[PDB]
Coordinates of C-alpha atoms in Angstrom, one line a residue:
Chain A
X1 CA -13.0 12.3 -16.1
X2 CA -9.7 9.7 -16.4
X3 CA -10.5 8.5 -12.8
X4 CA -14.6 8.7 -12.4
X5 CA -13.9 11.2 -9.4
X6 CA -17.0 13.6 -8.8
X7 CA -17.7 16.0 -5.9
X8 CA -19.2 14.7 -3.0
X9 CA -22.9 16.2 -3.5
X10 CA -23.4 15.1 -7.2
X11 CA -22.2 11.7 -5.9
X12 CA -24.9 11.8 -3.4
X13 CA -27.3 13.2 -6.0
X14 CA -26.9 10.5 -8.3
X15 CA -26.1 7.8 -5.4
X16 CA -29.7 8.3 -3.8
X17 CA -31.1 8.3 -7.2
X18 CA -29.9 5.0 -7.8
X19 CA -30.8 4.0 -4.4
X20 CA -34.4 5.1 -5.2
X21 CA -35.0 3.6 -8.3
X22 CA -33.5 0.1 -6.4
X23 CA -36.2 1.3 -3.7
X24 CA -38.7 1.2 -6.1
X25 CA -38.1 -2.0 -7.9
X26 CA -38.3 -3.3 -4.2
X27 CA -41.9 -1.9 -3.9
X28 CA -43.1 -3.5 -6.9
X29 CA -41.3 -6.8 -7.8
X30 CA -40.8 -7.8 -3.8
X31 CA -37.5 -9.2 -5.2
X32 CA -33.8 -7.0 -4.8
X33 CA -31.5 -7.8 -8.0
X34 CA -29.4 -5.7 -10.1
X35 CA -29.5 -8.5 -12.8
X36 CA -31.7 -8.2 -15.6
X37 CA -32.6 -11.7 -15.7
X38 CA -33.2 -11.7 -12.2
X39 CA -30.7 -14.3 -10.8
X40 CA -28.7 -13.3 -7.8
X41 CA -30.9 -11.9 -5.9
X42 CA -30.5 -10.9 -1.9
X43 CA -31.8 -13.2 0.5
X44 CA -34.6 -10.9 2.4
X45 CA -36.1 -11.8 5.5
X46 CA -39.4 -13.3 5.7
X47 CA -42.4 -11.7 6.0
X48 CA -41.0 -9.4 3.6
X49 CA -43.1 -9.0 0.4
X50 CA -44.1 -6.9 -2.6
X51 CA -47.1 -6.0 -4.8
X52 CA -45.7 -8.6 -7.1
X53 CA -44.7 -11.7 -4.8
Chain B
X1 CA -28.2 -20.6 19.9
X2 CA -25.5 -17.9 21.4
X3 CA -27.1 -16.5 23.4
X4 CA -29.5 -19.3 26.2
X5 CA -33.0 -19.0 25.1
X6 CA -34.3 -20.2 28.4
X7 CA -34.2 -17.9 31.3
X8 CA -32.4 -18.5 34.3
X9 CA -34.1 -18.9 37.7
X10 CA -31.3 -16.9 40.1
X11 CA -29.7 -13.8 39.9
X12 CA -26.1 -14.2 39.6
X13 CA -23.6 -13.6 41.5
X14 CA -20.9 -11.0 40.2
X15 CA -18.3 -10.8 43.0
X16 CA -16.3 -12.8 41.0
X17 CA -13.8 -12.2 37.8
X18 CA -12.0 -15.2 37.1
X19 CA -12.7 -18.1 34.9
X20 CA -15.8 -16.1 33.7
X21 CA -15.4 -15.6 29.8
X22 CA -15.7 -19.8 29.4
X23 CA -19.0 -18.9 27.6
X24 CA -20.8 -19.9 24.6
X25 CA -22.1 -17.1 24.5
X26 CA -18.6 -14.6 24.3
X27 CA -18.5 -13.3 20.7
X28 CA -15.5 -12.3 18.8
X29 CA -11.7 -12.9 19.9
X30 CA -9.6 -12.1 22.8
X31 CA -7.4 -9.9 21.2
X32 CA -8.9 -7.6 18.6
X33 CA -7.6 -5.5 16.5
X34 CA -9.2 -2.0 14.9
X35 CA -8.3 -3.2 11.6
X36 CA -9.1 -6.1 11.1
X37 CA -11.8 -6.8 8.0
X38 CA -15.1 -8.1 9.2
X39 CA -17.9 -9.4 6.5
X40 CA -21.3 -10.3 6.5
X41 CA -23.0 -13.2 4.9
X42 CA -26.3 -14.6 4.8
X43 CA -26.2 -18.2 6.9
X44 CA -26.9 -21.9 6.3
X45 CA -27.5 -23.5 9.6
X46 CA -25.8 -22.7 12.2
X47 CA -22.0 -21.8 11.6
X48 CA -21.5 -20.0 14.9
X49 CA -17.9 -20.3 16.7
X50 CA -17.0 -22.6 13.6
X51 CA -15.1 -22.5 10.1
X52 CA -17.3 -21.0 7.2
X53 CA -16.8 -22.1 3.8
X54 CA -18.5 -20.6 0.7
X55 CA -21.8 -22.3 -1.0
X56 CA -24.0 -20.8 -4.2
X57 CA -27.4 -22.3 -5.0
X58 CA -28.6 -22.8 -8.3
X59 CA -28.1 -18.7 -9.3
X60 CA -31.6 -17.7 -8.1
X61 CA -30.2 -16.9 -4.7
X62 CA -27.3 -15.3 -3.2
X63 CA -23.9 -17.2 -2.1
X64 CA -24.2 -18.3 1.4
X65 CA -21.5 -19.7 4.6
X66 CA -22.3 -23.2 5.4
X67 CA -20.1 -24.5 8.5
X68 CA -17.5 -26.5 7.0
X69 CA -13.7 -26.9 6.1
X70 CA -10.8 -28.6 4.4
X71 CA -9.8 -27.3 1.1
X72 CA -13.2 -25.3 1.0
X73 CA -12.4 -23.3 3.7
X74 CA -12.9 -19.4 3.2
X75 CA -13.0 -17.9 6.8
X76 CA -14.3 -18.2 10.4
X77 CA -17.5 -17.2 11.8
X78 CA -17.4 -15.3 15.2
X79 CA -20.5 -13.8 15.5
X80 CA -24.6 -14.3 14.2
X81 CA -27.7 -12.3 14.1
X82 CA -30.2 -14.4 14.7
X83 CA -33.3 -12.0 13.9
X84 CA -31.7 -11.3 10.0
X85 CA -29.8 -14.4 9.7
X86 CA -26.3 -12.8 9.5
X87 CA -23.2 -14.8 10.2
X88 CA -20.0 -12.2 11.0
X89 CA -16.7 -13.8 8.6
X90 CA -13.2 -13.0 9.7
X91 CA -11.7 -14.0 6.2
X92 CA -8.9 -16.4 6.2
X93 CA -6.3 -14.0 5.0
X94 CA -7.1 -11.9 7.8
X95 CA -5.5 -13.9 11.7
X96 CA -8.1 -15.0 14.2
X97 CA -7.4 -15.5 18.2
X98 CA -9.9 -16.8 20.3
X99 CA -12.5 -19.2 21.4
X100 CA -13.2 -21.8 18.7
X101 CA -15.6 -24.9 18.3
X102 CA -13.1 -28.4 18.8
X103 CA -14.1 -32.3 17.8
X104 CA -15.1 -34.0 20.9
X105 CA -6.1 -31.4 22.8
X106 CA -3.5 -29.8 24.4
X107 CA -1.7 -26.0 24.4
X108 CA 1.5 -26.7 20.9
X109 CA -1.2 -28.9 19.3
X110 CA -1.9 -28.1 15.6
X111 CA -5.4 -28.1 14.6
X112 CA -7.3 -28.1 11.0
X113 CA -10.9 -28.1 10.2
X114 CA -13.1 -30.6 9.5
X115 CA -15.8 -31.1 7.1
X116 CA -18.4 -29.8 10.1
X117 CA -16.4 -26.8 10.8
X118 CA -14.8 -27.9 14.0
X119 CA -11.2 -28.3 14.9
X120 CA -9.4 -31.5 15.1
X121 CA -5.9 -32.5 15.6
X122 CA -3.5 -33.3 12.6
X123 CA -1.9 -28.6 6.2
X124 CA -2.6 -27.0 9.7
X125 CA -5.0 -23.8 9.8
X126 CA -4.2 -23.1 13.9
X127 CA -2.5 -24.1 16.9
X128 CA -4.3 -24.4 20.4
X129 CA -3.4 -22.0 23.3
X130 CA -5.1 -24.1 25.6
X131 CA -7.0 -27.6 26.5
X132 CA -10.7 -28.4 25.7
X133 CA -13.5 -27.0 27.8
X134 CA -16.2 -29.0 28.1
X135 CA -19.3 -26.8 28.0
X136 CA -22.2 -29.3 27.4
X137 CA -21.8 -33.2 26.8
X138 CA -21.0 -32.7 23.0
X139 CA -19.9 -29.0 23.0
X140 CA -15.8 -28.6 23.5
X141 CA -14.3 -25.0 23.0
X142 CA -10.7 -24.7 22.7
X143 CA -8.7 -21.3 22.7
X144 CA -7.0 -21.3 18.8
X145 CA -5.0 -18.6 16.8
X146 CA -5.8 -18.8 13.2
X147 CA -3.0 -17.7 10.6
X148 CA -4.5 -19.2 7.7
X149 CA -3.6 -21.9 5.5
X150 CA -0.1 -23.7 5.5
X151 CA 1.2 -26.8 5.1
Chain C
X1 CA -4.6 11.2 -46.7
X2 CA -8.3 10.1 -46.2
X3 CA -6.6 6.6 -45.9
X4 CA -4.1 7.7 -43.9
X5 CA -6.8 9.4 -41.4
X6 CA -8.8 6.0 -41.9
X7 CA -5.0 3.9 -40.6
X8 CA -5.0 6.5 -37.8
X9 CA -8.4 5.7 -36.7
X10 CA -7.8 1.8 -36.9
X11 CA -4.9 2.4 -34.5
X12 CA -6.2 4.6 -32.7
X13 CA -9.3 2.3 -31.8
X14 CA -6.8 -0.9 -31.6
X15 CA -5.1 1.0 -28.7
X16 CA -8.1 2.4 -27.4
X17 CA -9.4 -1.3 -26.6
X18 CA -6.6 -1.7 -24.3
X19 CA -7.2 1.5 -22.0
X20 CA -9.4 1.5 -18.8
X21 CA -11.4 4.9 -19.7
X22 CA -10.8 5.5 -23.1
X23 CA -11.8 9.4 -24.3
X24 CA -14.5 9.5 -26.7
X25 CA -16.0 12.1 -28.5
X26 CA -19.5 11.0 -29.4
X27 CA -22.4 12.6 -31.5
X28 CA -25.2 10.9 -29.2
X29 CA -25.8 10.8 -25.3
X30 CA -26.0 7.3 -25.0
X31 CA -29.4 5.9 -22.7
X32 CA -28.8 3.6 -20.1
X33 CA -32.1 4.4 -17.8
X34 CA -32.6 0.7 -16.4
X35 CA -30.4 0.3 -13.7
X36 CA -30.1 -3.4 -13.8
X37 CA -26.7 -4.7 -15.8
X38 CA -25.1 -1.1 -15.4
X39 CA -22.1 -2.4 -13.8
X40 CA -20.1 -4.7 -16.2
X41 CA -18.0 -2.7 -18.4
X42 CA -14.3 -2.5 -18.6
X43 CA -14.3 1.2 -16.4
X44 CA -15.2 0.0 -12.8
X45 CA -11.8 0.2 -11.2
X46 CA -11.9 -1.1 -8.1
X47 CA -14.1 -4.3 -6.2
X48 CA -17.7 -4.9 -6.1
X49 CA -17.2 -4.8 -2.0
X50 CA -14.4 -2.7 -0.6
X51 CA -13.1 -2.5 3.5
X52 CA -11.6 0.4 4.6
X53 CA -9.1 -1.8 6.3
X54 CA -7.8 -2.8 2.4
X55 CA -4.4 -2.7 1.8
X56 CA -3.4 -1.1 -1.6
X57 CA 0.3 0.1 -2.8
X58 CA 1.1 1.9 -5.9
X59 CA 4.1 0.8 -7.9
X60 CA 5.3 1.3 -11.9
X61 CA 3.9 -0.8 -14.3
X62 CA 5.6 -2.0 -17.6
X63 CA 2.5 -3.1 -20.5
X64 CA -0.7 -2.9 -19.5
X65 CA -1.8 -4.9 -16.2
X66 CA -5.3 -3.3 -15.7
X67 CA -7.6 -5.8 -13.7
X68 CA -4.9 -8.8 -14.3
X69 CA -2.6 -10.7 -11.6
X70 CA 0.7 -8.5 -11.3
X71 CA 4.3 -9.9 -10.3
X72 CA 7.4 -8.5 -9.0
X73 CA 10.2 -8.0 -11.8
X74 CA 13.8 -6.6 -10.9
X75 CA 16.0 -5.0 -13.4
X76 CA 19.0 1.3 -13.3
X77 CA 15.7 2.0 -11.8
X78 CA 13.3 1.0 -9.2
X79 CA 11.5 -2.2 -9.6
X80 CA 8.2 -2.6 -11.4
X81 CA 5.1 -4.9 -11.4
X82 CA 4.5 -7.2 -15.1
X83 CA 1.3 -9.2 -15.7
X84 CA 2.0 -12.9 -14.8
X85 CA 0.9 -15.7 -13.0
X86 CA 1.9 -19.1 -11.8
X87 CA 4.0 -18.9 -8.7
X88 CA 5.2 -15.7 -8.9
X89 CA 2.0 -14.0 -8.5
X90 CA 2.7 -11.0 -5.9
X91 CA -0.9 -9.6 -6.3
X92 CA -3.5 -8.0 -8.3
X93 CA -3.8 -4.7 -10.1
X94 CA -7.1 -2.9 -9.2
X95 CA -6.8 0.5 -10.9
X96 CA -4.1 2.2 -13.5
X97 CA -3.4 6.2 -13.9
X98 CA -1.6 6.3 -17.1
X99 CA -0.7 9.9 -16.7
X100 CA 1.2 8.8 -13.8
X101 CA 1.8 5.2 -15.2
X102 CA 1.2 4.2 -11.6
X103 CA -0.8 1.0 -10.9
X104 CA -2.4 0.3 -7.6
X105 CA -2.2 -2.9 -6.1
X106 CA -4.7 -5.3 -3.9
X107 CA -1.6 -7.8 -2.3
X108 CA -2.2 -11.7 -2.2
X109 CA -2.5 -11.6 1.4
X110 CA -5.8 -9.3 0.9
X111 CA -8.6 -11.2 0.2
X112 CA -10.4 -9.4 -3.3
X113 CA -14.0 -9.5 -4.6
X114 CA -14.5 -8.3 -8.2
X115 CA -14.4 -8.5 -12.0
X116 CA -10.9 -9.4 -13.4
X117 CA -10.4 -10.1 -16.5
X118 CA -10.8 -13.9 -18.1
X119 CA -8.9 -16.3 -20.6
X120 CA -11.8 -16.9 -22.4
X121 CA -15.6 -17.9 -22.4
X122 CA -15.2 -20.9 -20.6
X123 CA -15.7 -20.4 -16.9
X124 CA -19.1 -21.2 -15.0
X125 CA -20.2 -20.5 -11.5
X126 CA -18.2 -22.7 -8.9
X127 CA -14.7 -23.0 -10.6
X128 CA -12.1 -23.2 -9.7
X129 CA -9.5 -20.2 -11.5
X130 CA -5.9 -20.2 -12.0
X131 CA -4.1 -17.0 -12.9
X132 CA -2.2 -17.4 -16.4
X133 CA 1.1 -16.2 -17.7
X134 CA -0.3 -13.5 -19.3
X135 CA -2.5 -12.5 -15.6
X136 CA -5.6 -13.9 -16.7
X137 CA -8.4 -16.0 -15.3
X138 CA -8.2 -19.5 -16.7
X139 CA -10.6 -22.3 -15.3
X140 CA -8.4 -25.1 -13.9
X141 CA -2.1 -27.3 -9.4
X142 CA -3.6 -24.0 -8.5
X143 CA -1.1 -22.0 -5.8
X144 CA -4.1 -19.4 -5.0
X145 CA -7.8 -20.1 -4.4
X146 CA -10.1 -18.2 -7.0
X147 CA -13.4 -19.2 -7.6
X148 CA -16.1 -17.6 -9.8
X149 CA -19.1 -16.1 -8.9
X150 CA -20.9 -15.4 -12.4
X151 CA -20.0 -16.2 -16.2
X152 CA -17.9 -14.6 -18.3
X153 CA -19.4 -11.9 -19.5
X154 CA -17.9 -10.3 -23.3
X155 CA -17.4 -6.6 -23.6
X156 CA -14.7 -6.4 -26.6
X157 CA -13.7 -8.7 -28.9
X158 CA -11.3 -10.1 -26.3
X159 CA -12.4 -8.4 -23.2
X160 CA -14.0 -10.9 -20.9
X161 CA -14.9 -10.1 -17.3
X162 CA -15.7 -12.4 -14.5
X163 CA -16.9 -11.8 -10.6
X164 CA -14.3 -13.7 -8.9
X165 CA -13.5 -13.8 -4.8
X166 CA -9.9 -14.2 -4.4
X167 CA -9.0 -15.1 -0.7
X168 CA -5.5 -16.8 -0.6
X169 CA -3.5 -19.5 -1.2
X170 CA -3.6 -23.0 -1.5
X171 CA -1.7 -25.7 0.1
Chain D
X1 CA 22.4 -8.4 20.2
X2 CA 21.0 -4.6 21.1
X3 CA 18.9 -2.4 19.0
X4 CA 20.3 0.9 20.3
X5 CA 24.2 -0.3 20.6
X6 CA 25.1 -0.1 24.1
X7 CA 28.9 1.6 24.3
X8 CA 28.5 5.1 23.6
X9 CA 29.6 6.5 20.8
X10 CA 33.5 8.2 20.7
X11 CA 32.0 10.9 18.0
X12 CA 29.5 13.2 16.7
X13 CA 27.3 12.2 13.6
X14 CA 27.9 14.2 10.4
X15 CA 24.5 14.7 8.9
X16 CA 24.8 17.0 5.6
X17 CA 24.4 14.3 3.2
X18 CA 21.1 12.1 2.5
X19 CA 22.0 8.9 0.5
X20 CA 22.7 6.0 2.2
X21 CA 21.9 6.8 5.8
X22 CA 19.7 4.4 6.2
X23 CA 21.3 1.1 6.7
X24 CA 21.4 1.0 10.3
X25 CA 20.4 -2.1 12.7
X26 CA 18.8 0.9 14.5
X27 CA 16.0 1.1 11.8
X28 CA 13.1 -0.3 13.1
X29 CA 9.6 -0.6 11.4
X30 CA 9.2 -1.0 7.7
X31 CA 10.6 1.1 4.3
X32 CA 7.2 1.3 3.1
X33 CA 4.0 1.0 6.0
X34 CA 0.4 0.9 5.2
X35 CA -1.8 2.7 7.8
X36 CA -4.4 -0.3 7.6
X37 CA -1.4 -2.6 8.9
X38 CA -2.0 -5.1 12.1
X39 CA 0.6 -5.1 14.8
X40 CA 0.6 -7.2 17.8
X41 CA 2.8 -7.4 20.8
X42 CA 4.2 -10.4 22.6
X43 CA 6.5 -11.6 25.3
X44 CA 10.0 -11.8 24.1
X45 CA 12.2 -14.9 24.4
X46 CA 16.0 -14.1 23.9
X47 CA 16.7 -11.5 20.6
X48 CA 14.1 -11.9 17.9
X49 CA 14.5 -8.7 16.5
X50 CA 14.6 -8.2 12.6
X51 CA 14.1 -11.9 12.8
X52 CA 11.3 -14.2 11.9
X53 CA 9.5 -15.4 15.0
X54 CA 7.5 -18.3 16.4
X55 CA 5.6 -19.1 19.2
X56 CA 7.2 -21.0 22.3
X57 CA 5.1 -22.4 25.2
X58 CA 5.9 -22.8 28.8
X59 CA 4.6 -25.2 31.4
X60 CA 1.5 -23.3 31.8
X61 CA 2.7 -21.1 34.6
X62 CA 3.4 -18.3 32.4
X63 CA 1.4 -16.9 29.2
X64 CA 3.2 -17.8 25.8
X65 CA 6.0 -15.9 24.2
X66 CA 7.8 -15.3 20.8
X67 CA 11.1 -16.7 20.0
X68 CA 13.2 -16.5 16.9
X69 CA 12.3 -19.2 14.2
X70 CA 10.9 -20.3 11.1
X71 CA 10.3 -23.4 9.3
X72 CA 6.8 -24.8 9.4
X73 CA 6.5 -23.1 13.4
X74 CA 6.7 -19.5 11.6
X75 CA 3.8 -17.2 12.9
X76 CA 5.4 -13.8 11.8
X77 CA 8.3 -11.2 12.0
X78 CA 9.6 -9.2 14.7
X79 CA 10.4 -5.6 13.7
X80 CA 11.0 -3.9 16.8
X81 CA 11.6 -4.2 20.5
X82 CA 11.0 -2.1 23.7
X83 CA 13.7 -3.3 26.1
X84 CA 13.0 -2.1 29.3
X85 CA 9.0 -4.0 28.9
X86 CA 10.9 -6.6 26.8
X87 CA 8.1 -6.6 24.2
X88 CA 8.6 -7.5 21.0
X89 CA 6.4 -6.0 17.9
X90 CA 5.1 -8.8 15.6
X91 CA 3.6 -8.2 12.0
X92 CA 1.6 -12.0 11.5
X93 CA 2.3 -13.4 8.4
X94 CA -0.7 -13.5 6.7
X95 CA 0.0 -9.6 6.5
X96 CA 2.8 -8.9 3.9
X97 CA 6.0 -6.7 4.9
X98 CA 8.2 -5.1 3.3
X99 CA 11.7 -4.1 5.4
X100 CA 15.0 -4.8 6.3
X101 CA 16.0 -8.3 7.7
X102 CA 18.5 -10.3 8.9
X103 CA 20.1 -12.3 6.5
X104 CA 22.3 -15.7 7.0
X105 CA 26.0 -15.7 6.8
X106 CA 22.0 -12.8 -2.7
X107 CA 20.7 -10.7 -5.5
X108 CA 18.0 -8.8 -5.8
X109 CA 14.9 -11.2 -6.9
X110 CA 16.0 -13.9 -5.3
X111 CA 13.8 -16.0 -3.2
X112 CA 14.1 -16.6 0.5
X113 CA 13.0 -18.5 3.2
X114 CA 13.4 -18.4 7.1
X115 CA 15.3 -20.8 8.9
X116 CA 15.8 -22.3 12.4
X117 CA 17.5 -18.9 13.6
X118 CA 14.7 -16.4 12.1
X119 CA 16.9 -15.7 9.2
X120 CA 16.5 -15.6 5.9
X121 CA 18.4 -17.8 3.1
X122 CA 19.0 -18.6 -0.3
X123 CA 16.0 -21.0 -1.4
X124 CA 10.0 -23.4 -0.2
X125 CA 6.7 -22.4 2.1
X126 CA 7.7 -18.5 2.5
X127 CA 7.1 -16.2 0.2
X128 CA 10.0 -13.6 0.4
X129 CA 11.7 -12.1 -2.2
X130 CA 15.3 -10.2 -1.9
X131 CA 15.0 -6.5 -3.5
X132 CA 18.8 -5.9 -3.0
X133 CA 22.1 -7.1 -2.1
X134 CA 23.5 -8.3 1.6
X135 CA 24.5 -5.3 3.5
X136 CA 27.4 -6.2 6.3
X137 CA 26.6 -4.4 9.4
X138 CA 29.3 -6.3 11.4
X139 CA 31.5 -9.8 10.7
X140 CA 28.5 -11.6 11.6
X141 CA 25.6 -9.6 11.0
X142 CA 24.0 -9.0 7.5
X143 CA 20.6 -7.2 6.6
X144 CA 18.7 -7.5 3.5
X145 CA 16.2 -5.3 1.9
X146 CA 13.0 -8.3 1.1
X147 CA 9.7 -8.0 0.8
X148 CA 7.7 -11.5 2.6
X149 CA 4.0 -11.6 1.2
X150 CA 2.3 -14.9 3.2
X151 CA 3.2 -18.5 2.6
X152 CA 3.3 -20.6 -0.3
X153 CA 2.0 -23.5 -1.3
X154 CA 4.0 -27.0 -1.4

C-alpha cells in the first residue's frame, strides 16, 4: 500500500481499463489529452479524425 | 530526405566494402551501445543528422525538436520516420559517436552547434574524428563524438 | 483529553502533509471516474517517461527530500544525501521508503522528466528553473538546465508541483 | 606501472579476516556499478589505468587512442586494462562513477579535479568529490575513494 505495488494481472486489469476509456475519448472527441481543459494534446497524424473533429 | 526518393537507374555493384557507409542515408552511430537511452519526439522540419533543441507552441499542442543549438541545445537527432513524423533524440546527457551534419575541419578540431543544428568550429559540445565529406554541394558530414556540454 | 486527541490530530495531519503516501482511514470511497487530471497529486513517485536504461542508487536520507534536488553530505556512519541546491546538487530524489529510510536517486548525469516540487506559484511554461537551497524549483546563474513544461499546480497549502525536463548542466 | 604486479609474490595470502582487504591497485571496476552502465574500449597509449583519460590522435595512419589526461581534453576514466590486447576500459564522463582513483602526491568531501597526468587534486569543470582519505599504496602512488558525476559549469 506504502509503495503503490500491485500484482501483475490487476495492473493489467486496471491498465487496459484506463487505456479503454483513453480509446474511447479518441473515438468521440478525435483529440488525445489527459488534461481536462484539453491543452497538451498529442500531435496525431493526419487523416486521423473523430466523430467530433 | 534520408533515404533518396528518386530511384536509381543501375543495379549496384556490391563487390566492394570500403568507403561505403559515406551515406546520408546511414542512421544511428558507429559505435552503439545496448544501453544507451533513445526518445521519440514529434518533429519540426527536418532535424535529421543535426542537433535538436526543445520548442512548445502556445499549450494546445505537444512540445516538439526543431533543429537547432547553442544554449538551447537538448539532444541529437539520428534517426526520422518520415510516415509519423518521428525524429529519434539521443539526449545530451547520454554520448553520441558518429556521422553528424557540419557548416559548409580537421580530425582534434572542437566543434559546437549552431543555431541551424550544424556543427561549426570554435563551450565545445564535440571533437571531429575526421575531415568533411562533401556529399552534395551544400551537404558536409563530418565523423564527431558528442560528450555533452563543457566549456 | 478531547483537546489533547484534538493536538494529536493537528500534528498528526501537520506531519502527514510532509509524507509521500500518507495512511488514511476514511468514511467515504472517494470518486474519481474521469480519467483526465488523475495524475497530479503528491503519490506518483517516479517520472512521467521512464527508460529502462535509467540509472537510480539508493542512499540514506536525513529530513525529508521526496521529489527535491538531493546533495552529497559527509559526516561515524556512511554518508547521506540532504535537500539542497546551488552547486552542490549531486542529483534528484525520485522515490522515498520510510520504513527503510532509503531514498532512491535519478543522478545529474541522467536526464529526468517529471513533477518535482516548486518554490512557489510563479513558474510558467518555458522557464528557465534553478534548484534552491532548500531543493526546490525556483524560476530564475543557473549550473543545471531545467525548464518547465506546465504551471504550478497546488495540492497542499505549500505543496506545488511542476512538469519539469531536467537534462544537464549548463556552461 | 602494472595492474597485476609483475615479481611474484615471496608468500601466501592470509585470508580469515574481511575488513580492509580491499585497497589494492589490483581492484579494478567500480565499489558500487549499475547494470545500465556504458563501457567502451579503446587503444591504450602508455598507463592510463585508474587515471582520467583523453583522446590522442595520430597522423591518420592508425585509428585514435586514449592517453592519460584531464583538463579541458578530459573525455572519461579508465578503470581497467587487458594487457596482452592493450585495451583500456573507459566509463565517458557524462556517465557518473564512483571508485577508486589515483590521487596526486584530502578529506572526505573535498572537491577534485583531474590534471595533466589523469590524477586527481585538491580544487573547477569536474565534478568529483573525495569520500575518504589518501590511501598510500607505494611512495609514489596514492588512491582515493571519489565519486566524479559529469562536468561543471564555469
Amino acid at each position: 500500500i506504502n509503495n503503490n505495488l500491485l500484482p501483475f494481472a490487476q495492473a493489467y486489469k486496471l491498465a487496459s481499463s484506463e487505456i479503454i476509456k483513453l480509446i474511447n475519448h479518441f473515438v468521440l472527441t478525435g483529440t488525445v489529452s489527459i488534461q481536462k481543459d484539453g491543452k497538451n494534446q498529442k500531435r496525431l497524424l493526419p487523416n486521423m479524425y473523430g466523430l467530433l473533429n | 530526405m534520408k533515404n533518396p526518393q528518386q530511384d536509381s537507374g543501375l543495379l549496384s555493384n556490391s563487390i566492394d566494402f570500403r568507403d561505403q557507409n559515406l551515406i546520408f542515408s546511414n542512421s544511428g552511430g558507429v559505435c552503439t551501445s545496448s544501453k544507451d537511452k533513445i526518445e521519440n519526439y514529434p518533429a519540426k522540419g527536418y532535424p535529421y543528422k543535426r542537433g535538436v533543441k526543445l520548442s512548445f507552441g502556445d499549450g494546445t499542442t505537444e512540445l516538439e525538436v526543431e533543429a537547432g543549438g547553442g544554449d538551447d541545445l537538448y539532444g541529437v537527432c539520428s534517426d526520422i520516420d518520415e510516415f509519423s513524423g518521428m525524429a529519434t533524440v539521443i539526449p545530451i546527457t547520454n554520448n553520441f559517436t558518429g556521422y553528424l551534419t557540419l557548416k559548409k575541419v580537421n580530425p582534434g578540431d572542437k566543434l559546437n552547434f549552431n543555431q541551424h543544428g550544424e556543427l561549426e568550429k570554435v563551450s565545445v559540445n564535440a571533437i571531429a574524428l575526421s575531415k568533411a565529406h562533401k556529399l552534395t554541394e551544400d551537404l558536409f558530414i563530418v565523423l564527431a563524438s558528442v560528450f555533452g556540454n563543457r566549456a | 483529553t478531547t483537546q489533547l486527541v484534538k493536538e494529536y490530530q493537528e500534528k498528526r495531519s501537520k506531519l502527514e502533509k510532509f509524507m509521500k503516501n500518507p495512511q488514511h482511514d476514511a468514511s467515504l470511497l472517494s470518486n474519481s471516474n474521469e480519467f483526465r487530471d488523475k495524475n497530479v497529486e503528491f503519490f506518483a513517485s517516479g517520472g512521467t517517461r521512464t527508460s529502462k536504461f535509467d540509472k537510480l542508487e539508493n542512499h540514506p536520507f536525513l529530513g525529508y527530500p521526496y521529489k527535491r534536488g538531493v546533495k552529497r553530505v559527509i559526516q561515524h556512519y556512511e554518508p547521506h544525501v540532504e535537500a539542497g541546491g546551488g552547486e552542490d546538487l549531486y542529483g534528484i530524489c525520485i522515490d522515498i521508503d520510510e520504513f527503510s529510510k532509503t531514498a532512491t536517486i535519478v543522478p545529474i548525469t541522467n536526464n529526468f522528466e517529471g513533477y518535482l516540487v516548486a518554490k512557489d506559484s510563479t513558474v510558467k511554461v518555458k522557464d528557465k528553473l534553478i534548484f534552491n537551497k532548500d531543493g526546490a524549483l525556483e524560476k530564475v546563474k543557473a549550473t543545471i538546465n531545467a525548464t518547465a513544461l506546465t504551471d504550478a499546480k497546488q495540492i497542499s497549502n505549500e505543496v506545488y508541483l511542476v512538469k519539469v525536463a531536467v537534462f544537464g548542466n549548463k556552461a
